[PDB]
Design an enzyme around this catalytic site. Structure first.
Site, PDB file in Angstrom:
ATOM      1  N   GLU A  16       1.000  -1.202   0.130  1.00 28.99           N
ATOM      2  CA  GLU A  16      -0.042   0.023  -0.061  1.00 28.99           C
ATOM      3  C   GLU A  16       0.845   1.301  -0.070  1.00 28.99           C
ATOM      4  O   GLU A  16       2.202   1.252   0.140  1.00 28.99           O
ATOM      5  CB  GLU A  16      -1.058   0.062   1.074  1.00 28.99           C
ATOM      6  CG  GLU A  16      -2.296   0.486   0.918  1.00 28.99           C
ATOM      7  CD  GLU A  16      -2.857   1.547   1.810  1.00 28.99           C
ATOM      8  OE1 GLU A  16      -2.227   2.217   2.641  1.00 28.99           O
ATOM      9  OE2 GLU A  16      -4.153   1.240   2.253  1.00 28.99           O
ATOM     10  N   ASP A 129      15.078   8.312  -4.795  1.00 35.62           N
ATOM     11  CA  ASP A 129      14.119   7.488  -3.606  1.00 35.62           C
ATOM     12  C   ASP A 129      14.758   6.158  -3.289  1.00 35.62           C
ATOM     13  O   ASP A 129      14.190   5.427  -2.967  1.00 35.62           O
ATOM     14  CB  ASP A 129      12.752   7.759  -3.603  1.00 35.62           C
ATOM     15  CG  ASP A 129      12.076   7.397  -2.102  1.00 35.62           C
ATOM     16  OD1 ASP A 129      12.729   7.808  -1.096  1.00 35.62           O
ATOM     17  OD2 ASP A 129      11.054   7.297  -2.302  1.00 35.62           O
ATOM     18  N   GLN A 133      13.404  -0.403   0.828  1.00 37.30           N
ATOM     19  CA  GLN A 133      12.092  -0.678   0.627  1.00 37.30           C
ATOM     20  C   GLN A 133      11.697  -0.698  -1.008  1.00 37.30           C
ATOM     21  O   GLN A 133      10.552  -1.540  -1.358  1.00 37.30           O
ATOM     22  CB  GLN A 133      11.264   0.265   1.464  1.00 37.30           C
ATOM     23  CG  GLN A 133      11.374   0.127   3.070  1.00 37.30           C
ATOM     24  CD  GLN A 133      12.797   0.753   3.718  1.00 37.30           C
ATOM     25  OE1 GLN A 133      13.501   1.272   2.966  1.00 37.30           O
ATOM     26  NE2 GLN A 133      13.008   0.736   4.821  1.00 37.30           N
ATOM     27  N   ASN A 134      12.442   0.045  -1.434  1.00 39.08           N
ATOM     28  CA  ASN A 134      12.164   0.465  -3.117  1.00 39.08           C
ATOM     29  C   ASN A 134      13.201  -0.403  -3.834  1.00 39.08           C
ATOM     30  O   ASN A 134      12.965  -0.474  -4.979  1.00 39.08           O
ATOM     31  CB  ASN A 134      12.387   1.897  -3.528  1.00 39.08           C
ATOM     32  CG  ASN A 134      11.222   2.557  -2.667  1.00 39.08           C
ATOM     33  OD1 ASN A 134      10.249   2.138  -2.377  1.00 39.08           O
ATOM     34  ND2 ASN A 134      11.628   3.823  -2.682  1.00 39.08           N
TER      35      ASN A 134
HETATM   36  C1  LIG Z   1       7.151  -6.152  -1.447  1.00 41.32           C
HETATM   37  C2  LIG Z   1       6.650  -7.421  -1.458  1.00 41.32           C
HETATM   38  C3  LIG Z   1       6.559  -8.147  -0.429  1.00 41.32           C
HETATM   39  C4  LIG Z   1       7.106  -7.639   0.877  1.00 41.32           C
HETATM   40  O1  LIG Z   1       8.374  -7.669   0.901  1.00 41.32           O
HETATM   41  O2  LIG Z   1       6.292  -7.634   1.744  1.00 41.32           O
HETATM   42  C5  LIG Z   1       5.877  -9.551  -0.468  1.00 41.32           C
HETATM   43  C6  LIG Z   1       5.437  -9.833  -1.834  1.00 41.32           C
HETATM   44  C7  LIG Z   1       5.525  -9.204  -2.844  1.00 41.32           C
HETATM   45  C8  LIG Z   1       6.333  -7.967  -2.703  1.00 41.32           C
HETATM   46  C9  LIG Z   1       6.187  -7.111  -3.896  1.00 41.32           C
HETATM   47  N1  LIG Z   1       6.474  -7.466  -5.200  1.00 41.32           N
HETATM   48  C10 LIG Z   1       6.527  -6.438  -6.088  1.00 41.32           C
HETATM   49  N2  LIG Z   1       6.545  -6.528  -7.338  1.00 41.32           N
HETATM   50  C11 LIG Z   1       6.479  -5.148  -8.102  1.00 41.32           C
HETATM   51  N3  LIG Z   1       6.818  -5.059  -9.228  1.00 41.32           N
HETATM   52  N4  LIG Z   1       6.195  -4.285  -7.361  1.00 41.32           N
HETATM   53  C12 LIG Z   1       5.947  -4.118  -6.052  1.00 41.32           C
HETATM   54  O3  LIG Z   1       5.415  -3.087  -5.333  1.00 41.32           O
HETATM   55  C13 LIG Z   1       5.896  -1.854  -6.031  1.00 41.32           C
HETATM   56  C14 LIG Z   1       6.225  -1.136  -4.569  1.00 41.32           C
HETATM   57  C15 LIG Z   1       7.851  -0.974  -4.900  1.00 41.32           C
HETATM   58  C16 LIG Z   1       8.222  -0.818  -3.464  1.00 41.32           C
HETATM   59  C17 LIG Z   1       7.340   0.664  -2.995  1.00 41.32           C
HETATM   60  C18 LIG Z   1       5.956   0.754  -3.052  1.00 41.32           C
HETATM   61  C19 LIG Z   1       5.918   0.272  -4.770  1.00 41.32           C
HETATM   62  C20 LIG Z   1       6.026  -5.352  -5.282  1.00 41.32           C
HETATM   63  N5  LIG Z   1       5.804  -5.698  -4.025  1.00 41.32           N
END
Ligand SMILES: Cc1c(C(=O)O)cccc1-c1nc2nc(N)nc(OCC3CCCCC3)c2[nH]1
Ligand SMILES: [Mg+2]
Lengths: 300, 262
Positions: A16, A129, A133-134
């Site tokens: 989120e 940024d 986390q990114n």
């Molecule tokens: C981020 C995450 C977790 C976690 O570490 O809690 C668990 C499962 C999937 C993901 C996740 N996979 C993702 N794959 C892509 N392409 N984008 C994600 O999130 C976009 C996100 C990047 C980090 C900041 C907010 C926008 C993603 N977030």
């Protein structure tokens, strides 16, 4: 392009923020697993962060930059479809408490982050940024830059851009000190902090405010003067009253790091943005002489 | 120093050279527009110049807006009564892309003297985005100029402002400037400015960087020189007014050279 939206099956919420939910979904026809970032529309129209994110990621096709696959563009919703990655580097660092991240993985990840970044810079994009986390990792050993909502297309030479910028702990000193201009070196500073963080699993400069952040940097690297950084004492938010801390041996800043590692870290954390190493030149540092790309040591 | 990104300058210039060809509007679009003409477009672009002055927008923003408009009109027929809506939405998008502090949508609705509604502006924004498929990071005359400026010995502020002025004038007249790429217009403007102010020419170092010579720049240069010479008489005058300001060193008050001696 690829349609769509009736072809996707949402699997679960993964994230989120704004604007701003991310789901994991599967393309029902091709089997492809994606991340869907939903952006709610409306009274100022399409948000400028989204306009930048999308326009800039359309240009940036690279193995270490999150791939934007499609944009599903409706009256009231905008979905960005990305390739799915399994975890962020921050959650990976936390999962690796107790062992730490094996050096081959840290080396691999840094080498890939530098490739991703050099590609951005070569395509006139500042990320602005970079933080764990990114940065997203998969089960095959890739790491990718992601969240380009703060990114910007730059001109040569740079103009004055948004001052905010960069999450505080990863923010370069020339931003903290209010410089009129900042450049590609701000991203390198951030990755330097991230390098150190992969080795220690804890943020290098965890400031609680801009001044505290500056003071933590100064206590580690020495308070910069005109020798180390010509021009610094003339910067807008430089104060002659700043305490004058002695520079520490770098061996004391990240004790477990070898000579090559320390050399590279010290060049990424050079005060003078002119002397700070580029991502391009960092790829050739001797630290990387034995680099490989192993899978992550832990289940994702 | 790092503000001129030495490690990346040449990769960037190469990449912009590639993208200006992909972001180029269709040269013969106006002929396929039933209701609009080059002259209405010139009216529109001159109005965008005033809007950029009223809100103190970057010149880059203006250049991007014009690129968006010209790409949109290359595939979408527009009635004359709606040309300004397209232009307003283009300037809104460019502001959102390029500005630190873009004006709010209400300020764009206001500046169309309530010809259009906020809903219409926002709906057009969305249509422009779809027609352009969100490819907003277009190369502009300005992005090339600023790199060419690094080759001056020494830098000269009149030269830089004059070159921007000439480049800006080119935005107004689709005939002939639509047939020329941003990198070429920038080169001709840089040479013409350099010559007008200092007597100097397109330097060897920029031949090395761009592959362009005075011979390849000749056609654009001859157009630009005529444009410069005729500028006091053109129906559109907002660029000349703008470039009287001290911010741009009053360059619009400089006398064009009578001949180029090519
Ligand atoms: C981020 C995450 C977790 C976690 O570490 O809690 C668990 C499962 C999937 C993901 C996740 N996979 C993702 N794959 C892509 N392409 N984008 C994600 O999130 C976009 C996100 C990047 C980090 C900041 C907010 C926008 C993603 N977030
Ligand atoms: Mg540098």
């Amino acid at each position: 392009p690829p349609g769509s939206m009736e072809n996707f099956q949402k699997v679960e919420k993964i994230g989120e923020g704004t604007y701003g939910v991310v789901y994991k979904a599967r393309n029902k026809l091709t089997g492809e697993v994606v991340a869907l970032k939903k952006i709610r529309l409306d009274t100022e129209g399409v948000p400028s962060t989204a306009i930048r994110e999308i326009s800039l990621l359309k240009e940036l096709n690279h193995p270490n930059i999150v791939k934007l696959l499609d944009v599903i563009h409706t009256e009231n919703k905008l979905y960005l479809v990305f390739e799915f990655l399994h975890q962020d580097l921050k959650k990976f660092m936390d999962a690796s408490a107790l062992t730490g991240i094996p050096l081959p993985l840290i080396k691999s990840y840094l080498f890939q982050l530098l490739q991703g970044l050099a590609f951005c810079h070569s395509h006139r994009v500042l990320h602005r940024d970079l933080k764990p986390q990114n940065l997203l990792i998969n089960t095959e050993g890739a790491i990718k830059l992601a969240d380009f909502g703060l990114a910007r297309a730059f001109g040569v030479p740079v103009r004055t851009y948004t001052h905010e910028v960069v999450t505080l702990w990863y923010r370069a000193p020339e931003i903290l000190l209010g410089c009129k201009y900042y450049s590609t070196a701000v991203d390198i500073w951030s990755l330097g902090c991230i390098f150190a963080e992969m080795v220690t699993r804890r943020a290098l400069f965890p400031g609680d405010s801009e001044i505290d952040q500056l003071f933590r940097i100064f206590r580690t690297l020495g308070t910069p003067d005109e020798v180390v950084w010509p021009g610094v004492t003339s910067m807008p938010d430089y104060k002659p009253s700043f305490p004058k801390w002695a520079r520490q041996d770098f061996s004391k800043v990240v004790p477990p790091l070898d000579e090559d590692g320390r050399s590279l870290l010290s060049q990424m954390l050079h005060y003078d943005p002119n002397k700070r190493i580029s991502a391009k030149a960092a790829l050739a540092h001797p630290f990387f002489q034995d680099v490989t790309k192993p899978v992550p040591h832990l289940r994702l | 120093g790092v503000n001129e990104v030495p490690d990346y300058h040449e990769d960037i210039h190469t990449y912009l050279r590639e993208m200006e060809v992909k972001c180029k509007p269709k040269v013969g679009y106006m002929k396929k527009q039933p209701d609009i003409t080059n002259s209405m477009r010139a009216i529109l672009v001159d109005w965008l110049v005033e809007v950029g002055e009223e809100y103190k927008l970057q010149n880059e923003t203006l250049h991007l807006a014009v690129n968006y408009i010209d790409r949109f009109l290359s595939s979408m027929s527009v009635l004359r009564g709606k040309l300004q809506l397209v232009g307003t939405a283009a300037m809104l998008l460019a502001s959102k892309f390029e500005e630190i502090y873009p004006p709010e949508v209400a300020e764009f609705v206001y500046i169309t003297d309530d010809t259009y509604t906020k809903k219409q502006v926002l709906r057009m924004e969305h249509l422009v985005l779809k027609v352009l498929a969100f490819d907003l990071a277009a190369p502009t005359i300005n992005q090339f100029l600023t790199q060419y400026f690094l080759h001056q010995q020494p830098a000269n502020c009149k030269v830089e402002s004059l070159a921007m002025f000439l480049g800006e004038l080119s935005l107004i007249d689709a005939d002939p400037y639509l047939k020329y790429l941003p990198s070429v217009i920038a080169a001709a403007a840089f040479h013409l400015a350099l010559y007008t102010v200092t007597g100097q020419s397109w330097p060897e170092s920029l031949v090395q960087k761009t592959g362009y010579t005075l011979e390849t720049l000749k056609p654009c240069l001859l157009d630009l020189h005529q444009t410069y010479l005729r500028a006091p008489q053109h129906a559109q005058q907002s660029i000349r007014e703008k470039y009287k300001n001290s911010k741009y060193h009053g360059v619009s008050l400089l006398n064009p050279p009578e001949t180029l001696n090519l």
